[PDB]
Amino acid sequence: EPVLRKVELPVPTHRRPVQAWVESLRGFEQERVGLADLHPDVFATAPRLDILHQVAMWQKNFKRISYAKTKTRAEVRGGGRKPWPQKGTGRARHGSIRSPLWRGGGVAHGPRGPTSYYYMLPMKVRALGLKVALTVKLAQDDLHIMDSLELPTGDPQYLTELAHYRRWGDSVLLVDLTHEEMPQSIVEATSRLKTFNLIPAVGLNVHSMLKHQTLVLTLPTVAFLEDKLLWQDSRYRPLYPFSLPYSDFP
Amino acid sequence: FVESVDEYQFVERLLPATRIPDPPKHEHYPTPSGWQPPRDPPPNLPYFVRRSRMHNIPVYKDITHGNRQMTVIRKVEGDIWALQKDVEDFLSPLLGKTPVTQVNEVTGTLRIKGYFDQELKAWLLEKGF
Amino acid sequence: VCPPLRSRAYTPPEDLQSRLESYVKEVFLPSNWQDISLEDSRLKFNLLAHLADDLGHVVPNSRLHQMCRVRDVLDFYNVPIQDRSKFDELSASNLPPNLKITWSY
Amino acid sequence: YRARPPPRRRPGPRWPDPEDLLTPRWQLGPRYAAKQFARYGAASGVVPGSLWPSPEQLRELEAEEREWYPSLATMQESLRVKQLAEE
Amino acid sequence: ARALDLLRGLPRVSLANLKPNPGSKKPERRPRGRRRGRKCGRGHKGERQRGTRPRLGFEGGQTPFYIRIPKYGFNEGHSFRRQYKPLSLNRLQYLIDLGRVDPSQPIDLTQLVNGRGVTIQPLKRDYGVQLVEEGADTFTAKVNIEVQLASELAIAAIEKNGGVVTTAFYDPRSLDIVCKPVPFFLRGQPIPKRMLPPEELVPYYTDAKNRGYLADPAKFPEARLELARKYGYILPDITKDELFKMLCTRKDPRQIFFGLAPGWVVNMADKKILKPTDENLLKYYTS
Amino acid sequence: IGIRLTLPPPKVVDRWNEKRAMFGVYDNIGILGNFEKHPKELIRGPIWLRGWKGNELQRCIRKRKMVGSRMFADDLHNLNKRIRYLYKHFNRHGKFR
Ligand SMILES: [Mg+2]
Ligand SMILES: [Mg+2]
Ligand SMILES: [Mg+2]
Ligand SMILES: [Mg+2]
Ligand SMILES: [Mg+2]
Ligand SMILES: [Mg+2]
């Protein structure tokens, strides 16, 4: 029985939903167990590689906290007294043995304290980056939809052989709806693999999508991502943080 | 001291919506405020100009340096070059010269020197976008 | 049990139109079968899965949305693809006698 | 590998121990309890009766209102006398 | 789109292929090399080159311009002046047309904010919304709108369309609660009483010509007839309108929300409303 | 002679250690989790610069404000002196004015 997925959210009239093969991990040859219609606004948007770069750099940098620090001439030990008088010694004028010129002195313009690089791109920009990453994977034939992540066995060799047979990349990012419900078989298979990384739907990101050659999604994950990303489109300007109650926002 | 009750309808009324509501169906168009929904089916032109999330034509005035006046048609899909040709044809009689424009194919936007927001909005409404 | 890796090379069969129309009749009839629209997910899946199973070459997800008609399916399936590495592609290209290519990979 | 469990908000109310010296003072007052009740309903464990002012607080509020927010009749009388003086 | 076909043709997009949009990253200029070194753009020796030039506004000892101009009370009491966000009839009609404001129900500041028709900043001394006659000639909506200020022409347009307009006062606290009720409910405090207008504003809200929410309702028909006579339209008897009940609904002067009384506590977690029963609390919240 | 005469020991980097492999996960916790948690809440670091950024003067002011009471004696003295010096530098020195 084919597994056919339709687009729950409304699709623009001028656009037709893109399509993908719904596969399964239960067998090496089960490369087509159904057909999924994917929202064009999420899986066929423009190839915004500039937005991809923006979001990837934001992800790399906003968490960064450089702990590099150096002692200025005020913080270097000692160096209070004037080494020698201004005139008479025939030597250069100096005020302390800890000025930047001296060996062991302070650093004039070194790194100062733990520095944060935190900044936030607009949430619309970040959602657009996620959409662009998904569309890039689909257009480059690195996106594979699965009915479920259930495996016949939890042996990592099975998963690696399946990926190699199906010609997946050296790195695979599997995504499941929620952390709690992820199958034990796939959990065991991916816990022992380095290039096969399994994440919940909430953990999807541009950086990992780009790091991993292929992206594997389940049908519930596809629906969840479509809903969440399309919500950013056609949403009001916030009155207050969305964590607070809204009339129609779960 | 404390007495609970279920009159939460008057609180659900105050709860605000997160999603922009779809415009209600009107018996006659254009609507008193001038708003008009896109025609169904969409026009078969090589390009498409998607409405903004508020359901308005994505035509915006822009100003830089305090003297560079421009108009931007933003949410364009399809043949942005066909849209540029059509805009030039429609605007040249008004200016008397072919308007100078930038076709940002990457962003899918068209920028035109000078203020033509109202004229372009009316033109796109006529075209059915 | 792991089946051996399937070579990506695909040369269109000679009786490709006949095979395709037979499959179309099996799945779906009217004249000009080339223009039968695949707007129905069930029919599109049946036709494409049958073709992939028979020819050992499936429509990628990237081109899946573009198969709007049996004509599009025929166009996709009548274009060959060769998986030979660039080394082979260069060596077996009538290299002149004074050109020697060696690969250390 | 498998990702660590996604970070989640601590479910239910959060009640710091008053005995601890490091607990911030704002986390011990009645306003914190009121916010916890608003956020988590009856699961907060906050007695709803505490939300309204205690009689002393009500007396203070009434005194402040009498002092600073005059009645409509008083405002109208003041305006009337001011207008009479101006005329 | 041909762009996606080009992607299919092109190599895989990875972290080694990313590039910022050209023109979005200006090169960093640092003082090294012949062109940017030596004096590093600071010029010849002097106070500015040493980096100790006088403060901004200093004129070398001549009395500064901004100190030789006399002081005038241009901004005196600015932080205490009341501000009212304009809400043109054009904007109101546009919102009603797009369905972001429902004219079938009473329109107040809460509904306007929820529909995003206006942004209110009580912290910036915004005292509410003022109706603005702009767009009056093309206003064709029958609405029951409550505002803080209203121009004569705006009232005339609203009433000619068969609607009702009332000017209601809101202290800063009540205004903040009205504009953002959900955060107030999360504060877990009983709904406070709406304070009366300050003495200066009392006459405005007690005058019937302004449709003041404290004005005598007996004088409203006379004022409406006066406006109709002045602006040359026939006053529609809204009593015959099927929506007369909605057009008549008005919150009590001390009531912030239409159906919620002062002193109630809204438990949004379990969808409940706790109402005090103590006699002292009831008297206080009714006063 | 300020050049090493031997190649440095080869630097092997495991691009697929758990940290790199799972880097960035939950960066979209907000937009993909009903905004229960802000992405800045994923930041681990000094308490005074979690989800915040500023120049050196602002950083020092925030540090003194937030953990100044817990700072050691000489570290706090150095921070006070640094704040004073940075105030003088930013408010009295510079090319532009
Ligand atoms: Mg010293
Ligand atoms: Mg040192
Ligand atoms: Mg601009
Ligand atoms: Mg030079
Ligand atoms: Mg000079
Ligand atoms: Mg002098």
Swiss-Prot record, chain A:
Keywords: Methylation, Mitochondrion, Ribonucleoprotein, Ribosomal protein. It is found in: Mitochondrion. The keyword Transferase does not apply. One of its GO terms (cellular component) is mitochondrion. The modification Omega-N-methylarginine is found at residue 103. Its main location: mitochondrion. Component of the mitochondrial large ribosomal subunit (mt-LSU). Mature mammalian 55S mitochondrial ribosomes consist of a small (28S) and a large (39S) subunit. The 28S small subunit contains a 12S ribosomal RNA (12S mt-rRNA) and 30 different proteins. The 39S large subunit contains a 16S rRNA (16S mt-rRNA), a copy of mitochondrial valine transfer RNA (mt-tRNA(Val)), which plays an integral structural role, and 52 different proteins. Interacts with MIEF1 upstream open reading frame protein. This is Large ribosomal subunit protein uL4m. The lineage of its organism: Eukaryota, Metazoa, Chordata, Craniata, Vertebrata. The chain holds residues 45 to 294 of 311 of the full protein.
Curated annotation (Swiss-Prot), chain B:
GO terms for biological process: mitochondrial translation. One of its GO terms (cellular component) is mitochondrial ribosome. Ubiquitous. Residues 19-41 are annotated as: Disordered. GO terms for molecular function: structural constituent of ribosome. Keywords: Mitochondrion, Ribonucleoprotein, Ribosomal protein. It is found in: Mitochondrion. Its main location: mitochondrion. Belongs to the mitochondrion-specific ribosomal protein mL49 family. Component of the mitochondrial large ribosomal subunit (mt-LSU). Mature mammalian 55S mitochondrial ribosomes consist of a small (28S) and a large (39S) subunit. The 28S small subunit contains a 12S ribosomal RNA (12S mt-rRNA) and 30 different proteins. The 39S large subunit contains a 16S rRNA (16S mt-rRNA), a copy of mitochondrial valine transfer RNA (mt-tRNA(Val)), which plays an integral structural role, and 52 different proteins. Interacts with OXA1L. This is Large ribosomal subunit protein mL49. It comes from Homo sapiens. The gene is MRPL49. The chain holds residues 38 to 166 of 166 of the full protein.
From Swiss-Prot, chain D:
The keyword Metal-binding does not apply. It is found in: Mitochondrion; Nucleus. The keyword S-adenosyl-L-methionine does not apply. Belongs to the mitochondrion-specific ribosomal protein mL64 family. Residues 1-12 have a biased composition (Basic residues). Widely expressed. Highly expressed in the thyroid gland, heart, lymph nodes, trachea and adrenal tissues. Expressed at lower level in liver skeletal muscle, kidney, pancreas, testis, ovary and stomach. Barely detectable in adrenal adenoma and papillary thyroid cancer. This is Large ribosomal subunit protein mL64. Component of the mitochondrial large ribosomal subunit (mt-LSU). Mature mammalian 55S mitochondrial ribosomes consist of a small (28S) and a large (39S) subunit. The 28S small subunit contains a 12S ribosomal RNA (12S mt-rRNA) and 30 different proteins. The 39S large subunit contains a 16S rRNA (16S mt-rRNA), a copy of mitochondrial valine transfer RNA (mt-tRNA(Val)), which plays an integral structural role, and 52 different proteins. Interacts with GADD45A, GADD45B and GADD45G. Interacts with NR4A1 via the NR4A1 AB domain. Interacts with ATAD3A and ATAD3B. One of its GO terms (biological process) is mitochondrial translation. Residues 1-22 are annotated as: Disordered. The gene is GADD45GIP1. Keywords: Cell cycle, Coiled coil, Host-virus interaction, Mitochondrion, Nucleus, Ribonucleoprotein, Ribosomal protein. GO terms for cellular component: mitochondrial inner membrane; mitochondrial large ribosomal subunit; mitochondrial matrix; mitochondrion; nucleoplasm. Its main location: mitochondrion.
UniProtKB/Swiss-Prot annotation, chain F:
The keyword Ribosomal protein applies. GO terms for cellular component: mitochondrial inner membrane; mitochondrial large ribosomal subunit; mitochondrial ribosome; mitochondrion. Signal peptide: none annotated. One of its GO terms (molecular function) is structural constituent of ribosome. Keywords: Mitochondrion, Ribonucleoprotein, Ribosomal protein, Transit peptide. It is found in: Mitochondrion. Component of the mitochondrial large ribosomal subunit (mt-LSU). Mature mammalian 55S mitochondrial ribosomes consist of a small (28S) and a large (39S) subunit. The 28S small subunit contains a 12S ribosomal RNA (12S mt-rRNA) and 30 different proteins. The 39S large subunit contains a 16S rRNA (16S mt-rRNA), a copy of mitochondrial valine transfer RNA (mt-tRNA(Val)), which plays an integral structural role, and 52 different proteins. Interacts with OXA1L. Belongs to the mitochondrion-specific ribosomal protein mL51 family. This is Large ribosomal subunit protein mL51. It comes from Homo sapiens. The gene is MRPL51.
